[PDB]
Design a protein around this ligand. Structure first.
Ligand SMILES: NC(=O)C1=CN([C@@H]2O[C@H](COP(=O)(O)OP(=O)(O)OC[C@H]3O[C@@H](n4cnc5c(N)ncnc54)[C@H](OP(=O)(O)O)[C@@H]3O)[C@@H](O)[C@H]2O)C=CC1
Ligand SMILES: NC(=O)C1=CN([C@@H]2O[C@H](COP(=O)(O)OP(=O)(O)OC[C@H]3O[C@@H](n4cnc5c(N)ncnc54)[C@H](OP(=O)(O)O)[C@@H]3O)[C@@H](O)[C@H]2O)C=CC1
Ligand SMILES: Cc1cc(Cc2ccc(O)cc2)n(O)c(=O)c1
Lengths: 358, 367
């Protein structure tokens, strides 16, 4: 068995929780040993501990550099009645992301028989009661000049206004994180309010020509945008990853939520078909990054090999129902076209046993 | 021939000009008489009269309530070279949309082989450390209220200001409420007023205030409604959002009376450079067509014109069923079979397809 190493892991809620534990038992644990830092971010325990588990996991990823997350219920009032929650806890994803910072990257996992691009996305509001000038001024620390611009002269009635700012560090971190991400994937990077979006274009060209393999970098405009490049700005085949600026810290996760409807059938006793692929690839991306930080040739191999098996299994006709309805059309799907949740996991395990045996 | 009424019409540029005249000669004029208020918004005539023609149309739509516009070249430096323009004239749409006001509505046209969305700046660069503030100074010399946008203490960056008046927000409501009632469709407003508690909050409220004071009645009167949402949770309805040869843009004035319609695609220059060269083209008229039927059907409503209203409805159907039965342009055939696999016997060119819509409009109307 591979010594993978130190990996933070957060468990979730409902249907993705069922799949999380399956992934560990049929795909991960049987081939890899981890010095595992589990945190139980299920809604019940988050409530029980006063969203404390959530803070504890986040600091761990800050400490051990690698996190993989199971999808988690975010509370609104309907949930608060359901779990009798003592408060309406903020999303753990929000909680975690502030503590760690960085930029998210959503990659669709591409299968060859279904209908890659990595997109990475990146204030003072008030009420103007009645008429009057609303201006925005800038006064440098060395008291040399006062530059004041007029946002609008309210002559009509009143209304609403707002202010928005931005420091260089934040944009430099968009750049670093985006250029670094381009080399890890070996893909070209593209970057898509005359003077606002302009300041973005520059710091990119400046970090590019200062630190940053048969690769390059370019700029564009929204509407101007074969497939296989990094772009800076079924669901169960989406994989978002939060990349911290330093380049060391990484958190991986499914891009879908907890699939409650499938879980409600699971409870009722009915047969389901939840796509594990998103949650799966959350693990392999985190494991492969662990491998990078540790120069772990054995592990790195395993990570890629499991990403392989997953794609080859669907490419071979064995798949779940969300994928079978994407190929054939929902109303035209027969039961012998897809596998259920527990059978598709069996096939991957069987193909992972064989693929890894050779 | 049906008595249509008072309708402003503006001719456009390049390929949309070719298709436009095909629409009038082969689909509209042969069945409908209009008191026609043509204005020629071609880049030349706009140049020649000093974009005057453009202003004349706006006040014309402002007067007669119903307008249909053909896609029109917007000048950039390159265009000024081609035509030797005397100036780089503002978009005709920019001009016209200022004079009339209202809210644009883009509706995607569904072929079986719909959502109506209607959407709603001062930026500068912060060189080095220092405070950027945004202030409010009332007209009645009362206190001046100062908010701090941010104190940059390390280095620089960027900042910006953004506004919105109530008149602006109140006109968003109506234009969105009118369009929902015209369509017998439910209305949803997607704000982001969790983050922006005081900004979009003003949006969310002014919407719930208009709903009651005037529109809760008539909404139940068509078993329809209105609700508010937040962007990601919103993920046959009218969608208001605080922010291709089958796309149809329509400007709804708040009053409910004035309406200007047009295809959402541009002048299709590439196909036109082929047209000039003498080569065979294949451009989609449905959008340009549907502009007419939205403006004609709006005309019919204001005037109790069952004859016109049917005809409008009848033509829109002809367009959709003509494609739903397999006769289409190349952009649509490339949607079905994939771009690299498109054979010529899959699609019709511009002049064969207009023929087919015309033929089908003869038989349909015969019934
Ligand atoms: N912490 C996190 O990472 C996130 C958490 N959430 C949470 O999800 C909870 C409710 O789930 P909800 O947002 O409504 O539903 P989902 O976000 O999980 O996805 C909605 C629909 O997409 C389909 N879907 C998504 N993933 C899969 C999959 N692996 N296999 C098959 N189908 C899939 C299902 O379609 P179908 O109808 O066919 O069954 C599902 O009903 C919320 O309480 C919210 O807090 C939301 C977003 C991310
Ligand atoms: N005043 C107005 O109403 C508007 C004016 N414009 C002006 O149009 C001019 C040029 O527009 P441009 O952006 O280049 O072209 P378009 O915006 O119209 O679209 C360009 C391409 O999109 C495809 N396309 C769009 N509509 C159709 C259609 N009906 N049938 C088939 N294909 C279509 C074509 O691709 P393909 O080549 O592969 O076939 C076409 O070459 C500009 O100067 C611009 O200012 C732009 C928007 C509205
Ligand atoms: C100049 C201009 C153009 C459009 C339409 C448009 C279409 C395609 C495109 O790529 C960009 C603009 N409108 O609506 C305006 O008010 C003003």
């Amino acid at each position: 068995k591979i010594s993978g190493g130190s990996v933070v892991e957060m468990q979730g809620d409902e249907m993705t929780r069922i799949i999380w534990e399956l992934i560990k038992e049929k795909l991960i644990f049987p081939y890899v040993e981890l010095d595992l830092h589990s945190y139980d971010l299920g809604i019940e325990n988050r409530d029980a501990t006063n969203d404390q588990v959530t803070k504890d996991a986040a600091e761990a990823i800050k400490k051990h550099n690698v996190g993989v997350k199971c999808a988690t219920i975010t509370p609104d009032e309907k949930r608060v009645e359901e779990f009798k929650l003592k408060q309406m806890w903020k999303s753990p994803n929000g909680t975690i992301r502030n503590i760690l910072g960085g930029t998210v990257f959503r990659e669709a996992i591409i299968c060859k028989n279904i209908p890659p691009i990595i997109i990475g996305h990146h204030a003072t509001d008030f009420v103007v009661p009645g008429p009057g000038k609303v201006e925005i001024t800038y006064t440098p620390s060395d008291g040399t000049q006062k530059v004041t611009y007029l946002v609008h002269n309210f002559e009509e009635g009143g209304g609403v206004a707002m202010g928005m700012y931005n420091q260089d560090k934040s944009i430099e971190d968009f750049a670093h994180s985006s250029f670094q991400m381009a080399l890890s994937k070996g893909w070209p990077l593209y970057l898509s309010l005359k003077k606002y979006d302009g300041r973005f274009k520059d710091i990119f060209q400046e970090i590019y020509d200062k630190q940053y393999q048969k690769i390059w970098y370019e700029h564009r405009l929204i509407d101007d945008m074969e497939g296989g490049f990094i772009w800076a700005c079924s669901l169960g085949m989406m994989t978002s990853v939060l990349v911290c600026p330093d380049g060391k810290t990484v958190e991986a996760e499914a891009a879908h939520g907890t699939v409650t409807r499938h879980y409600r059938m699971y409870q009722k006793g009915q047969e389901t078909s939840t796509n594990p692929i998103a949650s799966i690839f959350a693990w392999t991306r985190g494991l492969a990054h662990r491998a990078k930080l540790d120069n772990n040739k054995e592990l790195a191999f395993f990570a890629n090999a499991l990403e392989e098996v997953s794609i080859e299994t669907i490419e071979a006709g064995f798949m779940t129902k969300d994928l079978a309805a994407c190929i054939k059309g929902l109303p035209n799907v027969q039961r012998s076209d897809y596998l259920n949740t527990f059978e598709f996991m069996d096939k991957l395990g069987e193909n992972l046993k064989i693929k890894l045996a050779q």
